Amino acid sequence: MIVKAKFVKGFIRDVHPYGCRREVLNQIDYCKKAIGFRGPKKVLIVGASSGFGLATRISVAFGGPEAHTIGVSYETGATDRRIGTAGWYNNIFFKEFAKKKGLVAKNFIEDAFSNETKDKVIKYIKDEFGKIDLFVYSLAAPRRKDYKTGNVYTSRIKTILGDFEGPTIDVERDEITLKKVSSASIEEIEETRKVMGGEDWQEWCEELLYEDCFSDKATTIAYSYIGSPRTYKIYREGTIGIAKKDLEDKAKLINEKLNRVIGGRAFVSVNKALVTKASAYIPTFPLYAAILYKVMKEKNIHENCIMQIERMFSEKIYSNEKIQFDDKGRLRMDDLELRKDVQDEVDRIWSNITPENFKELSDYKGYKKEFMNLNGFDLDGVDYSKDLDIELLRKLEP
Numbered sequence: 183m184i185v186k187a188k189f190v191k192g193f194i195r196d197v198h199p200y201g202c203r204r205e206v207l208n209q210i211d212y213c214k215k216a217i218g219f220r221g222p223k224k225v226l227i228v229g230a231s232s233g234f235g236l237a238t239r240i241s242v243a244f245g246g247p248e249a250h251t252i253g254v255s256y257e258t259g260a261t262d263r264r265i266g267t268a269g270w271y272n273n274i275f276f277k278e279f280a281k282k283k284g285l286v287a288k289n290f291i292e293d294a295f296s297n298e299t300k301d302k303v304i305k306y307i308k309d310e311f312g313k314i315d316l317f318v319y320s321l322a323a324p325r326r327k328d329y330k331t332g333n334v335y336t337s338r339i340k341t342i343l344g345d346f347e348g349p350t351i352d353v354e355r356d357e358i359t360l361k362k363v364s365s366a367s368i369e370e371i372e373e374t375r376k377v378m379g380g381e382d383w384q385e386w387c388e389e390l391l392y393e394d395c396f397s398d399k400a401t402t403i404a405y406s407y408i409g410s411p412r413t414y415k416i417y418r419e420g421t422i423g424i425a426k427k428d429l430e431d432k433a434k435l436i437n438e439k440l441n442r443v444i445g446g447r448a449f450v451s452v453n454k455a456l457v458t459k460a461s462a463y464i465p466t467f468p469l470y471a472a473i474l475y476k477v478m479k480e481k482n483i484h485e486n487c488i489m490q491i492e493r494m495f496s497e498k499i500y501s502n503e504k505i506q507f508d509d510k511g512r513l514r515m516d517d518l519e520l521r522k523d524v525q526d527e528v529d530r531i532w533s534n535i536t537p538e539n540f541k542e543l544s545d546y547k548g549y550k551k552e553f554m555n556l557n558g559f560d561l562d563g564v565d566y567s568k569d570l571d572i573e574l575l576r577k578l579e580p
């Protein structure tokens with residue numbers, strides 16, 4: 183079978199599994215070439231299979247600390263109709279590389295919202311892994327199940343106080359298109375807060391702390407976004423923004439408890455805009471990211487996931503220099519994105535953007551490549567003419 187990049191309902195149908203291997207290896211190679219940092223030895227990451235969580239895992243394992251890692255993710259493998267998710271394969275190839283380096287890399291392919299999943303991970307930590315010094319909560323989900331009551335909360339990306347309509351980039355068609363987003367009901371706001379707020383992160387932290395799973399002075403981090411006024415309507419001041427503010431509020435509560443009990447700490451890191459599976463489908467995000475890429479590349483300050491994470495750990499969290507938070511106690515990795523000259527240029531380009539000129543004014547090429555790359559496509563050192571053995575791929579284990 184020769185896997186080709188193709189779309190179904192605006193989603194890539196089949197990832198290229200060996201491309202995913204190459205993309206994991208590219209991030210590992212960046213970390214191996216980096217100056218290096220030291221700090222964490224035993225790391226738990228929820229949402230470890232792709233995007234920021236995968237970069238987090240690769241950073242601590244290969245960027246100097248030689249950390250053992252537990253990854254919890256929800257992914258699916260090959261069926262008789264589907265090849266498996268990018269994250270499915272990322273987990274597998276990360277493990278292969280980590281094992282060769284002599285590192286523990288445990289995968290739990292499980293729903294993190296489950297009480298059952300928490301018990302499994304806690305059991306593994308107590309029995310086998312040893313206490314955790316770093317816990318990263320990097321989860322992006324469309325829904326949350328409350329396993330006790332059977333209730334399902336659905337995450338919706340909607341606006342508040344007024345419908346939205348604005349340009350976006352359709353990767354399937356290489357075109358600018360208008361996307362409509364409607365106002366959320368109070369129930370929809372609450373459900374999104376239930377899924378993408380800090381409740382589950384807080385529950386993980388409490389269960390970990392109280393079952394004696396954290397090392398003294400342990401750190402926990404969750405990831406957030408603030409962005410520019412170009413996206414306040416559909417992000418920061420929409421349903422997802424209300425959820426992220428709940429996440430930031432929970433960080434403060436978790437921080438107080440961890441500090442009191444083990445001298446530990448919790449904080450949100452507000453990261454920069456970039457292409458991941460989750461972000462690629464936020465309305466209008468492709469257009470903002472494409473312009474931002476253009477501006478930041480011209481100013482030599484562009485970063486992808488692995489560069490973001492490597493800088494965060496080596497320059498801010500585990501540095502010689504003391505960590506600096508914003509006035510709300512958040513770590514700011516959007517420090518370069520939200521720089522005044524960057525945002526001025528983004529706003530200026532944005533105002534000149536049309537369906538006819540967007541490829542000239544924005545870095546659509548770079549945006550599309552990063553989108554293709556995370557799905558295993560458009561990568562160097564991958565032979566895209568070679569047939570893949572499906573039986574071989576389906577036998578691979580996380």
Ligand SMILES: NC(=O)C1=CN([C@@H]2O[C@H](COP(=O)(O)OP(=O)(O)OC[C@H]3O[C@@H](n4cnc5c(N)ncnc54)[C@H](O)[C@@H]3O)[C@@H](O)[C@H]2O)C=CC1
Pocket residue numbers: 228229230231232233234235254255256257269292293294295319320321322323324405406407452453454455456457458459460461
């Ligand atoms: N990509 C961006 O522009 C930015 C993303 N962030 C935040 O980074 C965090 C991670 O998102 P990305 O890396 O962008 O997305 P991603 O789609 O690459 O990663 C999502 C991860 O969450 C896991 N996951 C989803 N439901 C799960 C479940 N029920 N149980 C266990 N794992 C589950 C997936 O398996 C995957 O590992 C999110 O909180 C997002 O809001 C923050 C700033 C920017």
Ligand code: NA
Pocket residue numbers: 229230231232233234235236320321322
């Ligand atoms: Na992630």
